[PDB]
């Protein structure tokens, strides 16, 4: 367990809240820099447009050459400096310091396993867990497709292919409902086809392999699995 006391939990939860305030202040600092740069851009747009609309008049009046040489020689360097200016040091410094108190990879895996143990103990469906349809979770937390994928991957590492299958199917389900996510169906189908084969369902593993190959026709292992499944089945 990552948490060694209630006070530790309280302190970290409050710290995260404070980090959101710090993040909002960073956003304001970037917005202010960007507003400055946009003003500068508009002015430069006007200046260059004004030159091309009367080129003979432009060269004919000497303030124009003087201002143009100075702008290119000097002003664009000032603008460059502003573009390069870092606005994130305050927020990043703060986050860096607070990370002293954060959990790490081992704690995140630990927490995933504890969720899986809960699911096993009470025989909870993946959909009930993901939608937060449990007392004390409802409207507090819900799982993304990528969270489902991660829990599936954790089960996979324990050789629990039963829960691998269930969680990968849940991920795939949410992707089909139209969830925008960083995980791709090909990754989910890779694990799902493998778990289903371990669970002794030959037909289903073949089918899932075919779905994968529809999305990624040159996936090497899936092509090999396709040939393998077909060979084994032809002999039964």
């Amino acid at each position: 367990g990552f948490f060694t006391s209630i006070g530790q939990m309280t302190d970290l939860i409050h710290t995260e809240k404070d980090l959101v305030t710090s993040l909002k202040d960073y956003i304001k600092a970037e917005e202010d820099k960007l507003e400055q740069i946009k003003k500068w851009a508009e002015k430069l747009d006007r200046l260059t447009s004004t030159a091309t609309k009367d080129p003979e008049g432009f060269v004919g009046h000497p303030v124009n050459a003087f201002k143009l040489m100075k702008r290119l020689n000097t002003e664009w360097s000032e603008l460059e400096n502003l573009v390069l200016k870092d606005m994130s040091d305050g927020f990043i410094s703060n986050l860096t310091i607070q990370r002293q108190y954060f959990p790490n990879d081992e704690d995140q895996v630990g927490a995933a396993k504890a969720l899986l143990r809960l699911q096993d103990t009470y025989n909870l469906d993946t959909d009930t867990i993901s939608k937060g349809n449990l007392p004390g979770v409802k409207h507090k937390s819900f799982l993304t497709a990528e969270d489902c994928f991660e829990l599936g991957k954790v089960a996979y590492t324990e050789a629990d292919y039963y829960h691998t299958e269930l969680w990968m199917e849940q991920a795939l389900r949410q992707l089909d409902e139209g969830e925008i996510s960083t995980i791709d169906k090909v990754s989910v189908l890779d694990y799902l086809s493998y778990a289903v084969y371990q669970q002794g369902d030959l037909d289903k593993a073949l089918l899932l392999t075919k779905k994968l190959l529809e999305l990624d026709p040159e996936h090497q292992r899936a092509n090999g699995n396709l040939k393998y499944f077909e060979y084994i089945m032809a002999k039964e």
Binding site: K153, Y156, D190, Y191, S193, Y194, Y197, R221, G224, N225, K227, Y228, E230, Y231
Partner: peptide
């Protein structure tokens, strides 16, 4: 002849 599935990922 084909080979049995390797680990995913």
């Amino acid at each position: 002849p084909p080979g049995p599935p390797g680990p995913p990922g």
